[PDB]
Amino acid sequence: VVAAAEKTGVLYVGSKTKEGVVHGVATVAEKTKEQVTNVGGAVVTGVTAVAQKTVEGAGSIAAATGFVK
Amino acid sequence: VVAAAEKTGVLYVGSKTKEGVVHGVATVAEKTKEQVTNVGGAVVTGVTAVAQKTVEGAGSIAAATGFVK
Amino acid sequence: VVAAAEKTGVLYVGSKTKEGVVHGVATVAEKTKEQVTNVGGAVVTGVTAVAQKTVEGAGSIAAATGFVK
Amino acid sequence: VVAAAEKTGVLYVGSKTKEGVVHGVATVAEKTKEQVTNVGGAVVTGVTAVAQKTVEGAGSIAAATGFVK
Amino acid sequence: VVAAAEKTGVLYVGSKTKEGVVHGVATVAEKTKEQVTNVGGAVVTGVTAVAQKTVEGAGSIAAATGFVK
Amino acid sequence: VVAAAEKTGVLYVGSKTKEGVVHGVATVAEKTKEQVTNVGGAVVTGVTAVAQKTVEGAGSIAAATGFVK
Amino acid sequence: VVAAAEKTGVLYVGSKTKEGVVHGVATVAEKTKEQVTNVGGAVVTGVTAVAQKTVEGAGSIAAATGFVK
Amino acid sequence: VVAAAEKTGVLYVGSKTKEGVVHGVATVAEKTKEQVTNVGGAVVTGVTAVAQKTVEGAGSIAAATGFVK
Amino acid sequence: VVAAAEKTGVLYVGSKTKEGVVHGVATVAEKTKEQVTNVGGAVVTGVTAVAQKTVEGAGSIAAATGFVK
Amino acid sequence: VVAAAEKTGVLYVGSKTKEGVVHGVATVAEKTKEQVTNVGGAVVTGVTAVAQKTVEGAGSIAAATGFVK
Amino acid sequence: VVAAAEKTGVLYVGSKTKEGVVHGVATVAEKTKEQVTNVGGAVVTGVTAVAQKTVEGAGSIAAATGFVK
Amino acid sequence: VVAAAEKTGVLYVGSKTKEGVVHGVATVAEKTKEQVTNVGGAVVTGVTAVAQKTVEGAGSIAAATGFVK
Numbered sequence: 061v062v063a064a065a066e067k068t069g070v071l072y073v074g075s076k077t078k079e080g081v082v083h084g085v086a087t088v089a090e091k092t093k094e095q096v097t098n099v100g101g102a103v104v105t106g107v108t109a110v111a112q113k114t115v116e117g118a119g120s121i122a123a124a125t126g127f128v129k
Numbered sequence: 130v131v132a133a134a135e136k137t138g139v140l141y142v143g144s145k146t147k148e149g150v151v152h153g154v155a156t157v158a159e160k161t162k163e164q165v166t167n168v169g170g171a172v173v174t175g176v177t178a179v180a181q182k183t184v185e186g187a188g189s190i191a192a193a194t195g196f197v198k
Numbered sequence: 199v200v201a202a203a204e205k206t207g208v209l210y211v212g213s214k215t216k217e218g219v220v221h222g223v224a225t226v227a228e229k230t231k232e233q234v235t236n237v238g239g240a241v242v243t244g245v246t247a248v249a250q251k252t253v254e255g256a257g258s259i260a261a262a263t264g265f266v267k
Numbered sequence: 268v269v270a271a272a273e274k275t276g277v278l279y280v281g282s283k284t285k286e287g288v289v290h291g292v293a294t295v296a297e298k299t300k301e302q303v304t305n306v307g308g309a310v311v312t313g314v315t316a317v318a319q320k321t322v323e324g325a326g327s328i329a330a331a332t333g334f335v336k
Numbered sequence: 337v338v339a340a341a342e343k344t345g346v347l348y349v350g351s352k353t354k355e356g357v358v359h360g361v362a363t364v365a366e367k368t369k370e371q372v373t374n375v376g377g378a379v380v381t382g383v384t385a386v387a388q389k390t391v392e393g394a395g396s397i398a399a400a401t402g403f404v405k
Numbered sequence: 406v407v408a409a410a411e412k413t414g415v416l417y418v419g420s421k422t423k424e425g426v427v428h429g430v431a432t433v434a435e436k437t438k439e440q441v442t443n444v445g446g447a448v449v450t451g452v453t454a455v456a457q458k459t460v461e462g463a464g465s466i467a468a469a470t471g472f473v474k
Numbered sequence: 475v476v477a478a479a480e481k482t483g484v485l486y487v488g489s490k491t492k493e494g495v496v497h498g499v500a501t502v503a504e505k506t507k508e509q510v511t512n513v514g515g516a517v518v519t520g521v522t523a524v525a526q527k528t529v530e531g532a533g534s535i536a537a538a539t540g541f542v543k
Numbered sequence: 544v545v546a547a548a549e550k551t552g553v554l555y556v557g558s559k560t561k562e563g564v565v566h567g568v569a570t571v572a573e574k575t576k577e578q579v580t581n582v583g584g585a586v587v588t589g590v591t592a593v594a595q596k597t598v599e600g601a602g603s604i605a606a607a608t609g610f611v612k
Numbered sequence: 613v614v615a616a617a618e619k620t621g622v623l624y625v626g627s628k629t630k631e632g633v634v635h636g637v638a639t640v641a642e643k644t645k646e647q648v649t650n651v652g653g654a655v656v657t658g659v660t661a662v663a664q665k666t667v668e669g670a671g672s673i674a675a676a677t678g679f680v681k
Numbered sequence: 682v683v684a685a686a687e688k689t690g691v692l693y694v695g696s697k698t699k700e701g702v703v704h705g706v707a708t709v710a711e712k713t714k715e716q717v718t719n720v721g722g723a724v725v726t727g728v729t730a731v732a733q734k735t736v737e738g739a740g741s742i743a744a745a746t747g748f749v750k
Numbered sequence: 751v752v753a754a755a756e757k758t759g760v761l762y763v764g765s766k767t768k769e770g771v772v773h774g775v776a777t778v779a780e781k782t783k784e785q786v787t788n789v790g791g792a793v794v795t796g797v798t799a800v801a802q803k804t805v806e807g808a809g810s811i812a813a814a815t816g817f818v819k
Numbered sequence: 820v821v822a823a824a825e826k827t828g829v830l831y832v833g834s835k836t837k838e839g840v841v842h843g844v845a846t847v848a849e850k851t852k853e854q855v856t857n858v859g860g861a862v863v864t865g866v867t868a869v870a871q872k873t874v875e876g877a878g879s880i881a882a883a884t885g886f887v888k
């Protein structure tokens with residue numbers, strides 16, 4: 061991601077890059093009711109506006125896994 | 130992703146790139162009712178506006194897995 | 199991510215980069231009711247506006263895992 | 268991430284970079300009711316506006332894990 | 337992250353970098369009610385506007401872990 | 406993170422860097438009620454505007470761990 | 475609009491009424507361009523989510539009238 | 544709008560009424576461009592989430608009127 | 613708007629009323645550009661989340677009127 | 682707006698009333714640009730979260746009027 | 751607005767009333783640019799979170815009027 | 820606005836009233852730029868969190884008026 065310019069008037073040079081970006085989010089909630097009952101497991105809920113960038117690794121978002129033996 | 134320009138008037142050079150981007154989201158909820166009952170498992174719910182970029186890895190979003198033996 | 203310019207008028211050179219960024223978020227909640235009952239497990243909820251960048255590692259967001267033996 | 272310029276008029280050279288950044292967040296809550304009952308487990312809730320950058324390590328945000336034997 | 341300039345008019349050279357930064361956050365709460373009952377476990381809640389940068393280590397934010405044997 | 410300049414008019418050279426910074430936070434609370442009852446465990450709550458940078462070590466923010474045997 | 479109940483089990487009596495109410499509206503706009511040129515007249519535009527109740531009077535919403543002589 | 548109850552079990556009596564109410568509105572705008580040129584007239588624009596109740600009077604919302612002679 | 617109750621178990625009596633109320637509004641704007649040029653007239657713009665109740669009078673919201681002679 | 686109760690168990694009597702009330706509003710703005718040029722007129726803009734109750738009078742919100750002769 | 755109660759158990763009697771009230775408002779602004787040029791007129795802008803109650807009088811909020819002769 | 824109670828257990832009698840009240844406001848601003856140029860007129864800007872109650876009089880908030888002859 062480089063940007064070079066030479067001159068020998070308006071000159072514009074740009075190089076933009078986005079990875080894993082969340083923006084411009086508007087949320088309205090009213091009288092939302094939730095009830096979770098877990099017995100020896102895994103429950104994931106209520107995930108909003110989450111951004112993640114992972115390099116040379118495993119990336120999990122809102123991941124629920126049962127018991128491992 | 131490069132951008133070069135030479136001059137010897139308006140000159141514009143650009144190079145944009147997006148990967149895993151969420152934007153411009155509007156959500157309205159009213160009187161939403163939920164009920165989760167889990168016994169030794171995995172439950173995933175309520176995932177909204179999630180962006181992820183993964184390199185050299187396994188990326189999981191809202192992934193639920195049972196017990197592993 | 200470099201930016202070079204030479205001159206021998208307005209000259210602009212830029213190089214922007216974003217990874218794992220959340221912005222421009224507006225949230226309104228009213229009378230939200232929640233109830234969590236966990237017995238020997240894992241529960242994750244209420245995750246909002248979370249950004250993470252991980253290099254040479256495993257990145258987990260809102261990840262719930264059962265008991266490991 | 269470098270920035271070089273030579274001159275021999277307005278000249279601008281820039282090189283910006285963001286990783287794991289949260290900004291521009293407005294949150295309003297009214298009469299929110301919560302109730303958590305945990306017996307030998309792990310519960311995570313109420314995570315908002317969290318940014319993290321990890322190098323050569325495992326980064327977890329709002330991660331709940333059951334008992335490990 | 338370097339910045340060099342040579343001259344032989346306005347000349348600007350900059351090199352900015354951000355990692356794990358939270359800013360521009362406004363939060364309003366009214367009559368929020370919470371109740372936590374824990375018996376031999378781990379509960380995490382009420383995390384807001386948290387930034388962390390970790391090098392050569394494992395970084396955990398709002399992480400709850402059960403008993404380890 | 407260096408910054409060099411040579412001259413032989415306004416010349417500006419800068420090199421800024423931020424890691425783990427929280428700023429521009431405004432919080433208003435009214436009649437918030439909390440109640441925590443813990444019996445041999447760990448409870449973490451009410452964490453706001455926390456920044457940490459760790460080098461060659463494990464950094465935990467708002468981390469609750471059960472009893473270790 | 476009355477509600478009466480007598481008792482000598484769950485008993486519910488209600489009487490709800492709505493007049494001129496707008497709710498549950500989500501709007502997303504992107505790159506909208508407008509241009510208005512008025513010379514001695516009246517122009518009305520961009521009216522959204524407007525509610526009005528008028529008693530013993532004339533109610534006008536987004537009403538444009540030319541010059542009156 | 545009255546509510547009466549007599550007792551000699553759960554008993555509920557209610558009487559709700561709404562007039563001119565706007566709620567549950569989420570709006571997202573991006574790069575909206577506007578341009579207004581008025582010469583001796585009236586221009587109205589950008590009206591959103593407006594509620595009004597008028598008794599014994601004339602109620603106007605986003606009303607533009609030309610010159611009156 | 614009255615509420616009476618007599619007793620000789622849970623008894624609830626209520627009487628609620630709303631007039632001209634705006635609530636639960638979330639707005640996100642990004643790079644909005646505006647330009648107004650007025651010469652001897654009236655321009656109204658950028659009206660959001662406005663509530664008004666008027667008794668025995670004329671109520672105007674975002675009303676633009678030309679010159680009156 | 683009265684509330685009476687007699688007793689000879691939980692008894693609740695209430696009488697609530699709202700007129701011209703704005704609440705639960707979250708607004709986020711980024712890089713908004715405005716430009717107003719007025720020559721002998723009236724310009725109104727940038728009105729947000731305004732509530733007014735008027736009795737025996739004329740109530741105007743964000744009202745622009747030209748010159749009166 | 752009265753409240754009476756007689757007794758001869760929990761008894762609750764209340765009578766609440768609101769007129770012209772603004773609350774629960776969170777606003778975030780970033781890099782907003784404005785420019786006003788007025789020549790013998792009236793300009794009003796930047797009005798936020800304003801409440802007014804007027805009895806036996808004319809109440810104006812963010813009202814701009816041209817020259818009166 | 821009266822409150823009476825007689826007794827011959829918890830008894831509660833209340834009578835609350837609000838007029839022109841602003842509360843629970845959180846505002847964050849960053850790099851806001853303004854520029855006002857006025858020549859024989861009136862400019863009003865930057866009004867926030869203003870409450871006023873007027874009896875037997877005309878109440879104006881953020882009102883700009885041109886020259887009066």
Ligand SMILES: Cc1ccc(OCC(=O)Nc2cc(-c3ccc(F)cc3)no2)cc1C
Pocket residue numbers: 072076078081083
């Ligand atoms: C998340 C994100 C991604 C990409 C972004 O990039 C948008 C952008 O660069 N917009 C632009 C350019 C100009 C302009 C004005 C005058 C000129 F002479 C030349 C250019 N004005 O706005 C931004 C964000 C915030």
Ligand SMILES: Cc1ccc(OCC(=O)Nc2cc(-c3ccc(F)cc3)no2)cc1C
Pocket residue numbers: 145147
């Ligand atoms: C996420 C994302 C992706 C791509 C984006 O790119 C849009 C863009 O660049 N739009 C533009 C260009 C001009 C312009 C017009 C005439 C000129 F002379 C100079 C500039 N105005 O707006 C943005 C985002 C935010």
Ligand SMILES: Cc1ccc(OCC(=O)Nc2cc(-c3ccc(F)cc3)no2)cc1C
Pocket residue numbers: 208210214216
């Ligand atoms: C998160 C993020 C990503 C990208 C961003 O980049 C946007 C940007 O650079 N916008 C711009 C350029 C000009 C301009 C116009 C004419 C000139 F002559 C000189 C400069 N005005 O605004 C910002 C953010 C905050």
Ligand SMILES: Cc1ccc(OCC(=O)Nc2cc(-c3ccc(F)cc3)no2)cc1C
Pocket residue numbers: 277279283285290
């Ligand atoms: C988090 C974050 C990311 C990126 C950011 O970058 C935005 C930026 O640099 N905006 C800009 C440029 C100019 C300008 C004016 C006159 C000139 F001649 C040349 C440039 N004005 O605003 C900021 C933040 C806060």
Ligand SMILES: Cc1ccc(OCC(=O)Nc2cc(-c3ccc(F)cc3)no2)cc1C
Pocket residue numbers: 346352354
């Ligand atoms: C967190 C963060 C990240 C990046 C930031 O960078 C923004 C910035 O540099 N903005 C700018 C440039 C000028 C300017 C215009 C014309 C000139 F001739 C000289 C300077 N004015 O504002 C800031 C923060 C606070």
Ligand SMILES: Cc1ccc(OCC(=O)Nc2cc(-c3ccc(F)cc3)no2)cc1C
Pocket residue numbers: 484486490492497
């Ligand atoms: C704008 C508007 C109009 C009408 C509305 O009225 C809906 C409503 O009253 N829903 C309801 C009743 C019950 C219930 C639960 C248990 C019981 F024993 C008896 C009743 N639960 O939700 C609301 C709005 C917000």
Ligand SMILES: Cc1ccc(OCC(=O)Nc2cc(-c3ccc(F)cc3)no2)cc1C
Pocket residue numbers: none
């Ligand atoms: C997600 C995404 C993908 C692609 C996008 O690209 C759209 C775009 O670039 N639109 C444009 C160009 C111009 C223009 C004006 C004057 C000129 F002289 C030359 C060009 N105006 O708007 C944006 C997004 C946000």
Ligand SMILES: Cc1ccc(OCC(=O)Nc2cc(-c3ccc(F)cc3)no2)cc1C
Pocket residue numbers: 553555559
């Ligand atoms: C604007 C507006 C209009 C009408 C509204 O009325 C809704 C309402 O009253 N809902 C309700 C009733 C019960 C309940 C259930 C069982 C019981 F035993 C006792 C009470 N739970 O929620 C609200 C608004 C905010």
Ligand SMILES: Cc1ccc(OCC(=O)Nc2cc(-c3ccc(F)cc3)no2)cc1C
Pocket residue numbers: 622624628630635
């Ligand atoms: C703007 C506005 C309008 C109307 C509103 O009215 C809603 C309301 O009253 N909800 C309710 C009732 C009960 C309940 C619980 C236990 C019981 F035994 C009996 C009743 N819980 O919530 C509120 C607002 C904020």
Ligand SMILES: Cc1ccc(OCC(=O)Nc2cc(-c3ccc(F)cc3)no2)cc1C
Pocket residue numbers: 691693697
């Ligand atoms: C603006 C506004 C309007 C109306 C409002 O009224 C809401 C309300 O009264 N809610 C409620 C009742 C109970 C309750 C439940 C069981 C009991 F036994 C006793 C009381 N809990 O919450 C509030 C506002 C802030």
Ligand SMILES: Cc1ccc(OCC(=O)Nc2cc(-c3ccc(F)cc3)no2)cc1C
Pocket residue numbers: 760762766768
């Ligand atoms: C602006 C505004 C308007 C109205 C408001 O009124 C709300 C209210 O009164 N809420 C309530 C009642 C009880 C309760 C608890 C135990 C009991 F036995 C009986 C009642 N707890 O909270 C407040 C504001 C701040």
Ligand SMILES: Cc1ccc(OCC(=O)Nc2cc(-c3ccc(F)cc3)no2)cc1C
Pocket residue numbers: 829831835837
């Ligand atoms: C601005 C404003 C308006 C109205 C307000 O009124 C709220 C209120 O009165 N709340 C309440 C009642 C009880 C309670 C519960 C059980 C008991 F036995 C005795 C008292 N706890 O909180 C406040 C403000 C600050």
